[PDB]
Design a protein around this ligand. Structure first.
Ligand code: U8O
Ligand code: MG
Lengths: 152, 150
């Protein structure tokens, strides 16, 4: 594997470990991974981090009742670019009515970019992904990992 | 100048975070590298290389979280790493009521020119370690004077 490929693999591992921990504890989370459509306008709404990605940092960001926990984390390649970012809310009727603002923000950004967003529900611990305007719910750990590996 | 504005913004981020921690009696340990290189201690932690903000500093030190045990080390105006190991002082001249956070701060200050800021989890008191000494029960103004002097 090239260094770029190894680094990607270390980022996926960090992301999946953090999401798995938060799902178990019902820690709400909203994590958008920038792809080929630039997310600069949404990164500038948040607190800048420009940090190396770790499972530990991702977890600490989303602990309830803390300064960084509300809003989205936006990742650019192997960095956490910013936290507490604003994303636009989708009006799609295919978002389950019981879902709150994190899921609607995730679908929202996914309608205007090619990003992949991961959502952990604070109600149920369920893991979802928003991509291309669609929300995919109740993901197993394996499903999520495969989704991330496919996103490369 | 830009460098001057950056240093002031960093001082202001740190003091805001420390004041929030002190109010809530959240234990914290924040070392600022100076001329003596601290790469061997930075290596023991989780790498961040992150922009400083009061928000990030607070999120790092929340109790019962992955990053809260150990020291934050700052270098070149950025958070280099969190959850870092610092050497425990063996000095017999530290207040006997204090524990390992304060002895770690004094320890690193014995072997480097760094400045360490400590928030006590018992009292919310704020102290600074430098040159082997611990300066206790600092006000906000006192801490800012220390940072500006440094
Ligand atoms: N040896 C240490 N390095 S950081 C820290 N924090 C609390 C107690 C000990 C230590
Ligand atoms: Mg299903």
């Amino acid at each position: 594997p090239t260094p770029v490929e190894e680094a990607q693999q270390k980022t996926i591992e960090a992301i999946t470990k953090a999401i798995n921990y938060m799902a178990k504890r019902r820690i709400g989370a909203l994590l958008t991974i920038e792809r080929d459509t630039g997310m600069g306008d949404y990164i500038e709404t948040g607190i800048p981090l420009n940090a190396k990605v770790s499972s530990e940092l991702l977890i600490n960001i989303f602990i309830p009742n803390t300064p960084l926990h509300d809003g989205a984390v936006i990742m650019k390649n192997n960095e956490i670019a910013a936290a507490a970012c604003y994303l636009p809310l989708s009006e799609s009727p295919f978002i389950s009515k019981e879902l709150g603002t994190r899921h609607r923000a995730a679908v929202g950004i996914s309608e205007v970019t090619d990003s992949l967003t991961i959502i952990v529900s604070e109600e149920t611990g369920g893991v979802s992904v928003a991509k291309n305007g669609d929300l995919h719910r109740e993901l197993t750990e394996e499903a999520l990992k495969e989704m991330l590996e496919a996103e490369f």
